[PDB]
Design a protein around this ligand. Sequence first.
Ligand SMILES: Nc1ncnc2c1ncn2[C@@H]1O[C@H](COP(=O)(O)OP(=O)(O)OP(=O)(O)O)[C@@H](O)[C@H]1O
Ligand SMILES: Nc1ncnc2c1ncn2[C@@H]1O[C@H](COP(=O)(O)OP(=O)(O)OP(=O)(O)O)[C@@H](O)[C@H]1O
Ligand SMILES: Nc1ncnc2c1ncn2[C@@H]1O[C@H](COP(=O)(O)OP(=O)(O)OP(=O)(O)O)[C@@H](O)[C@H]1O
Lengths: 41, 535, 83
Amino acid sequence: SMAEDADMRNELEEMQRRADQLADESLESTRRMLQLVEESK
Amino acid sequence: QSIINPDWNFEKMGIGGLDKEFSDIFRRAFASRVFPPEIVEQMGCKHVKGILLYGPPGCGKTLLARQIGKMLNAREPKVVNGPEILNKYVGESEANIRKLFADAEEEQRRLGANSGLHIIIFDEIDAICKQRGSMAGSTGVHDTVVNQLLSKIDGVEQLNNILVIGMTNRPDLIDEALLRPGRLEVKMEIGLPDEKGRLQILHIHTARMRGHQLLSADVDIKELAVETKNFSGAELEGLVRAAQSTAMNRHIKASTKVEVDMEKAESLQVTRGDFLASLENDIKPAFGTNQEDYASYIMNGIIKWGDPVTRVLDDGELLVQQTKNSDRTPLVSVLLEGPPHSGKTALAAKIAEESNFPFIKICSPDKMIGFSETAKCQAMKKIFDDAYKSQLSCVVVDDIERLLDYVPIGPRFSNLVLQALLVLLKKAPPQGRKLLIIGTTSRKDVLQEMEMLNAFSTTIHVPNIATGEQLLEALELLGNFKDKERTTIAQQVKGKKVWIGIKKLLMLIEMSLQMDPEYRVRKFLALLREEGASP
Amino acid sequence: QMGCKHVKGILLYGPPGCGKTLLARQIGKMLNAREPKVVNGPEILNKYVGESEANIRKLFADAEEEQRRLGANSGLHIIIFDE
Ligand SMILES: Nc1ncnc2c1ncn2[C@@H]1O[C@H](COP(=O)(O)OP(=O)(O)OP(=O)(O)O)[C@@H](O)[C@H]1O
Ligand SMILES: Nc1ncnc2c1ncn2[C@@H]1O[C@H](COP(=O)(O)OP(=O)(O)OP(=O)(O)O)[C@@H](O)[C@H]1O
Ligand SMILES: Nc1ncnc2c1ncn2[C@@H]1O[C@H](COP(=O)(O)OP(=O)(O)OP(=O)(O)O)[C@@H](O)[C@H]1O
């Protein structure tokens, strides 16, 4: 009388890597491009 | 390209004592893949895609499986060792099973009728092929895998380039649906070898070692084969290995340190003495006999103190001869009865030993202390089932009265054991074999009243000591009291009658012997007088 | 030349406290083999399906591999069970 094994509930897909600061950096460059393009006119 | 390897040869296989089984397996599995495909197509048949094997441990199943797997000039056979396809994630077990057959399906759909050949080995098929419950509330632990396997082996799609093989020890537990002629058709049993089989096995496991002069001329292979009776396959190899090890150990030494001789190791030889030694105390057969039980039951031997012992032995020999050389009566039983302490078990054991049968087993209550009736029934069933696997057998039931759990008060006893024994004393063995059963008891009237004497075919009587002359003869044979005291004791006992069993006589002698040197006879006489007769 | 393999198992039994573990440890440490893999009683049982078989198979993996990659010149391995 030993509770038999149980099937692994399932998989809950969840993926997180290095986006935060990589895209914040990406942004800081576009802003400066915009400023320069504005300045030229 | 031929299916069989170009250089394959039967003698290289290294198998002995299974010629007929191998021939039949070949005939039923591969005969259709040898002649050109035109005739096979004309006959419009389909090749078999299943095999099965079973038997007692140590008979050469895995060896045959591996040999048949290697016999084909095709891809390398896959393998599965018991529950090696189970998984915890949902549905992965079925995907694992399906992955096995993917290559065969791709081959079939691609190349058609000239496709290749594939093999698989579901070793320990019994582990994950238990019978389906077929009832709500009894959900099986492995049911989806069984259903997937059944669907894949023969389902909505057809295959003709596959072959499955199984091996197990319990052929009565495999799922019923997995044994019809469409999935697993050819099934065979592997049993204990015979004399010629043992000779062949010993010859194959010795040919190589004879190549480099490692056998003296004292080894008589035929004598060794005849001596060893009803030995499983593995035990011959075990005996040979142990003999080689013990022979080699003599040249080497050690104790305090480890060293090896270099001037004697080049004259190594193995003789019959080491073989004998090991045969005696190295390998203990499983379906045979050994002297330990006889030494335990014949502790004080047998002494011929009169006529009845000879008549009893002659009757036993006659019954043994009848069972051995008869065909209309393959089941004969004899019941030994007598007063308590008359020494009846020893005579039964002596008859069983002298019978000279390959297989002898003694079922006694000594090993069943405290058991429940179900355990006793199971043990008896197992023993009798084991006794059905030999061309000659003999079983001895000891102390029936104590087996039934009898007690005069009430009286009380166990009905189930009595019913089992009654049904089990009329079951004829499988056709073509023989059996012999010997019983014992100390209360004949009880059994006669329970309607049990109509199951036994005969009956013998074992009497006690009846006259002073036989008591004197037994005393002289034992050799405890010398002539001087013998005269005095005889002068008393000669003029009367006695009633004692030999075991009680031994105990009385032992008890008397503890007194002073010149007080033994008087106390012995007093004890004998106090014993009484009680006819 | 003899064409024989080696025995694969040894079983020791006796009443508690007579010197079985000491003999086992000494015989294990005597040989030049690597450290003996030890199983402290039933420590391979698990609740999830198919974990006990994987754990059992894991023990023999290294020795099996080594045999495959060397052949007759492989090293020696030991496995010690408890209870
Ligand atoms: N006819 C035979 N000739 C030579 N060796 C044999 C023969 N039959 C069995 N053997 C021996 O069998 C040994 C392998 O064990 P085997 O496969 O026979 O056990 P098994 O019957 O499969 O046991 P289990 O009941 O666990 O499956 C080998 O050492 C092989 O020499
Ligand atoms: N010639 C003989 N005949 C019978 N028994 C003998 C003889 N010589 C010695 N014995 C001893 O008699 C003993 C009788 O066997 P055992 O101890 O089983 O007694 P039993 O009277 O047959 O049994 P039970 O107590 O169940 O009635 C045997 O152990 C054997 O040692
Ligand atoms: N032959 C021996 N000589 C000296 N010491 C011994 C001997 N046998 C056992 N011992 C002592 O046994 C002690 C440890 O015994 P241990 O409990 O390991 O043995 P065991 O009987 O195999 O155990 P277990 O009862 O757990 O199965 C060691 O300290 C050692 O001193």
